[PDB]
Amino acid sequence: GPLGSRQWTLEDFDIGRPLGKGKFGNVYLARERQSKFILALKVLFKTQLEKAGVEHQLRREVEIQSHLRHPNILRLYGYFHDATRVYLILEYAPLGTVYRELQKLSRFDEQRTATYITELANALSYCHSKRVIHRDIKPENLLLGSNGELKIADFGWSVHAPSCGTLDYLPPEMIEGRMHDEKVDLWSLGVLCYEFLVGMPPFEAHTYQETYRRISRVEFTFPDFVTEGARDLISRLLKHNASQRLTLAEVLEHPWIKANSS
Numbered sequence: 331g332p333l334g335s336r337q338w339t340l341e342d343f344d345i346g347r348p349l350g351k352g353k354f355g356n357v358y359l360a361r362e363r364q365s366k367f368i369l370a371l372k373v374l375f376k377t378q379l380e381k382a383g384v385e386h387q388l389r390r391e392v393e394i395q396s397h398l399r400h401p402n403i404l405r406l407y408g409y410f411h412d413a414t415r416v417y418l419i420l421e422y423a424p425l426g427t428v429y430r431e432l433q434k435l436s437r438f439d440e441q442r443t444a445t446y447i448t449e450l451a452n453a454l455s456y457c458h459s460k461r462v463i464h465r466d467i468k469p470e471n472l473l474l475g476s477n478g479e480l481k482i483a484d485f486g487w488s489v490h491a492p493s494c495g496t497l498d499y500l501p502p503e504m505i506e507g508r509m510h511d512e513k514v515d516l517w518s519l520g521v522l523c524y525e526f527l528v529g530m531p532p533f534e535a536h537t538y539q540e541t542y543r544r545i546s547r548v549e550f551t552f553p554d555f556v557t558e559g560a561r562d563l564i565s566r567l568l569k570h571n572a573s574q575r576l577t578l579a580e581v582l583e584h585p586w587i588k589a590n591s592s
């Protein structure tokens with residue numbers, strides 16, 4: 331492909347409409363001028379990265395992504411900069427974010443949910459084998475390909491094991507500033523499964539302090555419609571003791587996953 335070749339500049343691209351907004355910058359549709367290749371560009375600001383102390387994290391993300399190749403991980407082809415801005419050259423996800431899909435549908439059926447969980451678990455299995463922990467799994471970081479396949483994105487917070495918004499997706503060991511490993515992604519997977527079926531994550535609250543309290547205690551309940559198989563998978567992922575959480579192999583072979591995934 332044309333985005334694997336070169337020292338990229340902004341003048342190499344036609345810029346299109348905004349695809350999304352982020353805390354650290356906007357994402358735009360783009361077209362590479364020579365090849366006419368359609369892609370996305372995320373535009374970040376130097377001052378903003380400097381002040382937050384995250385420039386090395388961005389370098390690490392680009393480096394991590396230079397190695398990862400999986401159909402359920404969104405490609406990051408490389409980056410360039412000008413005087414004031416840094417630009418990430420990204421694979422375009424034509425069907426948008428899972429975050430937006432959930433807003434539109436309110437909740438997902440068991441089939442769509444199990445299918446997304448399967449694809450996520452495959453992507454994460456691959457990351458963990460290449461010892462990469464994602465650490466930032468949530469619906470805004472999950473995008474959809476031409477055929478509706480899930481693609482994980484944003485390795486800006488990723489680390490090699492062991493080692494911005496709400497607390498909703500973070501496990502007890504992370505919110506308490508403790509040592510943590512690959513099992514953090516397993517907790518976030520449980521949170522996602524719940525959110526997909528219910529329409530909101532299990533520790534959601536009006537305050538950071540209440541979300542913190544409920545995560546620490548693993549204090550949550552299921553609405554009446556959540557089936558016993560889904561309850562089982564979620565309860566075996568949302569364990570305070572990280573070592574007790576299901577492995578990804580065990581998720582992919584879970585009876586509820588097997589029955590409902592396409």
Ligand SMILES: O=C(Nc1cccc(C(F)(F)F)c1)Nc1ncc(CCNc2ncnc3ccsc23)s1
Binds near residue numbers: 357420
């Ligand atoms: O955002 C990232 N990295 C980061 C972010 C903050 C801070 C840091 C730092 F701390 F500095 F390391 C690093 N990476 C990302 N990688 C992929 C992204 C997805 C961008 N969105 C889209 N992409 C393709 N198609 C569509 C369609 C709709 S939206 C959309 S964001």
